[PDB]
Structure 1
Amino acid sequence: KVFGRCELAAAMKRHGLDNYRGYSLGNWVCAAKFESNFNTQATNRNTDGSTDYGILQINSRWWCNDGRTPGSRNLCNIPCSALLSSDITASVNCAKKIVSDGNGMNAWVAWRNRCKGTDVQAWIRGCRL
């Protein structure tokens, strides 16, 4: 599924991401935009052999099991395939664990490079929330 901007903002809010660990909804929306272009099916192979999955490009090195990331963990206790669903629950639950891990949203390199410090509220402008 390719979410609309305001549609994703509503789903993220519903699932408890808005101000989670102090990160406003705009931050999450912005991260999703640059991680996946709002596409739940997005996958991207990394140089180290791990793969990033779903709307928030959650990585198989630590967070999910894909069966082809040697030495990796599965700290969210999910198959990485679950992170590709049209329903964002698994991605949101796992994101919450990630953002609690110590470095906040800096875990998402596209958030640090493209969202951090910017006017992230723009991402939820006009949305009925």
Structure 2
Amino acid sequence: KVFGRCELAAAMKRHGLDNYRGYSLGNWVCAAKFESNFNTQATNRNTDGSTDYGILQINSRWWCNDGRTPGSRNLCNIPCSALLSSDITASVNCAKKIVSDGNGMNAWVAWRNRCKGTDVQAWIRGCR
């Protein structure tokens, strides 16, 4: 599923992600835009052989199991395919774990490089 901007803001809020760990909703929408272009089915292989899955590009090196990332953990206790569903619940639950891990949203290097410090409220501007 490819979400629209306000549609994804509303789904993130309904799953408790707004102001989670202090990160306003615009930060989470901005991160999703640049990680996946709002596409739940996005996947991207990393040079190390892990893969990033779903609308927040959760990495199989730590967070989910895809059966092909040797030496990697599954700290969200979830198959990485669960992170590609139209329903964003599994991605949001796993994002809550990640953002609690010590470095906040810096875990998402697109957030750090493209969202951090910017006017992230523009991402929710106009949304009901």
Structure 1 vs Structure 2: percent identity of aligned residues? Answer: 100
Alpha-carbon distance in structure 2 between the residues aligned to 1:106 and 1:68: 25
Report the secondary structure of 1:44's partner residue. Answer: strand
Alpha-carbon distance in structure 1 between the residues aligned to 2:18 and 2:118: 17
What's the C-alpha RMSD, in Å, of the aligned pairs?
0.2
In the alignment, structure 1 segments of 5+ residues that lack a partner are none
Alpha-carbon distance in structure 2 between the residues aligned to 1:121 and 1:73: 34
In the alignment, structure 2 segments of 5+ residues that lack a partner are none
In the TM superposition, residue 92 of structure 1 has moved relative to its aligned partner by 0.1
Moved over 4 A (4+): none
Deviations 1:61-111 (A, max 9, x none): 000000000000000000000000000000000000000000000000000
In the TM superposition, residue 13 of structure 1 has moved relative to its aligned partner by 0.2
* TM-score (normalizing by structure 2): 1.00
- The aligned counterpart of 2:59 is 59
* TM-score (normalizing by structure 1): 0.99
Give the number of aligned pairs: 128
Alpha-carbon distance in structure 2 between the residues aligned to 1:70 and 1:108: 22
Report the secondary structure of 2:64's partner residue. Answer: coil
Report the secondary structure of 1:16's partner residue. Answer: coil
